[PDB]
Scaffold this motif. Structure first.
Motif, PDB file in Angstrom:
ATOM      1  N   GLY A 183       0.824  -1.193   0.000  1.00 15.79           N
ATOM      2  CA  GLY A 183       0.000   0.000   0.000  1.00 15.79           C
ATOM      3  C   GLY A 183       0.861   1.245   0.000  1.00 15.79           C
ATOM      4  O   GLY A 183       1.434   1.624   1.027  1.00 15.79           O
ATOM      5  N   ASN A 184       0.944   1.892  -1.164  1.00 17.15           N
ATOM      6  CA  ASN A 184       1.865   3.007  -1.389  1.00 17.15           C
ATOM      7  C   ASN A 184       3.243   2.731  -0.779  1.00 17.15           C
ATOM      8  O   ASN A 184       3.944   3.646  -0.335  1.00 17.15           O
ATOM      9  CB  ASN A 184       1.263   4.319  -0.877  1.00 17.15           C
ATOM     10  CG  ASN A 184       1.963   5.536  -1.437  1.00 17.15           C
ATOM     11  OD1 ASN A 184       2.926   6.036  -0.855  1.00 17.15           O
ATOM     12  ND2 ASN A 184       1.482   6.026  -2.574  1.00 17.15           N
ATOM     13  N   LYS A 185       3.628   1.451  -0.758  1.00 23.09           N
ATOM     14  CA  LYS A 185       4.998   0.988  -0.546  1.00 23.09           C
ATOM     15  C   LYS A 185       5.721   1.615   0.645  1.00 23.09           C
ATOM     16  O   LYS A 185       6.643   2.418   0.467  1.00 23.09           O
ATOM     17  CB  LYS A 185       5.818   1.198  -1.824  1.00 23.09           C
ATOM     18  CG  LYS A 185       7.268   0.701  -1.748  1.00 23.09           C
ATOM     19  CD  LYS A 185       7.401  -0.634  -1.005  1.00 23.09           C
ATOM     20  CE  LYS A 185       6.772  -1.783  -1.774  1.00 23.09           C
ATOM     21  NZ  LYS A 185       6.981  -3.088  -1.086  1.00 23.09           N
ATOM     22  N   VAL A 186       5.294   1.277   1.858  1.00 25.66           N
ATOM     23  CA  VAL A 186       6.058   1.596   3.061  1.00 25.66           C
ATOM     24  C   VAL A 186       7.456   0.996   2.983  1.00 25.66           C
ATOM     25  O   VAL A 186       7.697   0.006   2.281  1.00 25.66           O
ATOM     26  CB  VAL A 186       5.314   1.091   4.314  1.00 25.66           C
ATOM     27  CG1 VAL A 186       5.043  -0.390   4.191  1.00 25.66           C
ATOM     28  CG2 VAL A 186       6.138   1.352   5.574  1.00 25.66           C
ATOM     29  N   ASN A 187       8.389   1.606   3.715  1.00 26.31           N
ATOM     30  CA  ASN A 187       9.711   1.030   3.935  1.00 26.31           C
ATOM     31  C   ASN A 187      10.308   1.603   5.213  1.00 26.31           C
ATOM     32  O   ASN A 187      10.640   2.791   5.265  1.00 26.31           O
ATOM     33  CB  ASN A 187      10.648   1.300   2.750  1.00 26.31           C
ATOM     34  CG  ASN A 187      12.094   0.949   3.062  1.00 26.31           C
ATOM     35  OD1 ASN A 187      12.373   0.146   3.952  1.00 26.31           O
ATOM     36  ND2 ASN A 187      13.020   1.542   2.318  1.00 26.31           N
ATOM     37  N   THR A 188      10.439   0.753   6.234  1.00 26.18           N
ATOM     38  CA  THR A 188      11.117   1.107   7.476  1.00 26.18           C
ATOM     39  C   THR A 188      11.200  -0.119   8.389  1.00 26.18           C
ATOM     40  O   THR A 188      12.264  -0.732   8.502  1.00 26.18           O
ATOM     41  CB  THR A 188      10.424   2.304   8.160  1.00 26.18           C
ATOM     42  OG1 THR A 188      11.039   2.568   9.427  1.00 26.18           O
ATOM     43  CG2 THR A 188       8.916   2.108   8.333  1.00 26.18           C
ATOM     44  N   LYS A 189      10.091  -0.489   9.029  1.00 24.42           N
ATOM     45  CA  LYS A 189       9.948  -1.700   9.828  1.00 24.42           C
ATOM     46  C   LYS A 189       8.468  -1.981  10.007  1.00 24.42           C
ATOM     47  O   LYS A 189       7.652  -1.060  10.073  1.00 24.42           O
ATOM     48  CB  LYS A 189      10.637  -1.599  11.198  1.00 24.42           C
ATOM     49  CG  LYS A 189      12.098  -2.049  11.265  1.00 24.42           C
ATOM     50  CD  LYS A 189      12.214  -3.578  11.189  1.00 24.42           C
ATOM     51  CE  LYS A 189      13.652  -3.998  11.343  1.00 24.42           C
ATOM     52  NZ  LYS A 189      13.853  -5.441  11.353  1.00 24.42           N
TER      53      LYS A 189
END
Lengths: 50, 50, 50, 50
Positions: free
Chosen positions: A23-29
């Motif tokens: 979903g709109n490409k999260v990136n972190t953890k």
């Protein structure tokens, strides 16, 4: 209040060499939190829930 | 939750944090930009940490 | 120069470095609020936790 | 010193204008009012001489 502001949305983390939410490409953890367990924030340093 | 839109969204708080801090830094109480070093009477900063 | 042993063979280092393929530090007494903020935005946009 | 004589009072309020000058040197009138109080001071030394 500052002390509580530290703890307000305690969480646990999730991991894997896998697909983080597309979903709109999260990136972190990856996490689940008291922002997710029915409870949530609202701008006054206040809580919101379902 | 931190979709790139969210990651931009959450960022857009920081600019407002950045803006506010810049505002309060440049605050011209009694004419003095209260924190231009001791030389508080003239521009202390810009938005970019200069 | 070689040869060497599993026991560390040691020899004194340089006086100076001027530019480097530097190691990655996250710990310091010091502060640079604005440059930090923009740098963390860089981490957020692409999603650098690592 | 019926009415503590002008010079000593010119000095007094002049020194009051000083602490005011500390309030805002960018407020040029602090200079002008300060200057004026001495002006009475000095000219009052002058007239007493005569």
């Amino acid at each position: 209040r500052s002390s509580i502001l530290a703890d307000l949305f305690d969480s646990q983390v999730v991991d894997g060499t896998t697909e983080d939410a597309n979903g709109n490409k999260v990136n972190t953890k990856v996490m689940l939190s008291m922002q997710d367990f029915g409870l949530s924030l609202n701008d006054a340093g206040t809580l919101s829930f379902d | 939750s931190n979709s790139q839109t969210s990651r931009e969204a959450i960022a857009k708080e920081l600019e407002r944090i950045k803006e506010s801090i810049v505002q309060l830094a440049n605050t011209s109480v009694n004419g003095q930009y209260l924190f231009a070093g001791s030389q508080v009477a003239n521009k202390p900063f810009d938005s970019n940490g200069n | 120069a070689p040869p060497f042993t599993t026991t560390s063979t040691v020899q004194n280092g340089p006086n100076f470095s001027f530019s480097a393929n530097n190691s990655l530090t996250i710990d310091e007494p010091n502060v640079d609020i604005i440059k930090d903020l923009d740098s963390m935005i860089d981490a957020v946009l692409k999603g650098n936790m690592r | 010193d019926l009415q503590n004589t002008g010079i000593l009072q010119d000095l007094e309020n002049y020194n009051k204008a000083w602490n005011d000058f500390a309030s805002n040197p960018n407020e040029n009138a602090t200079k002008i009012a300060l200057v004026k109080a001495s002006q009475t001071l000095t000219e009052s030394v002058n007239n007493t001489f005569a």
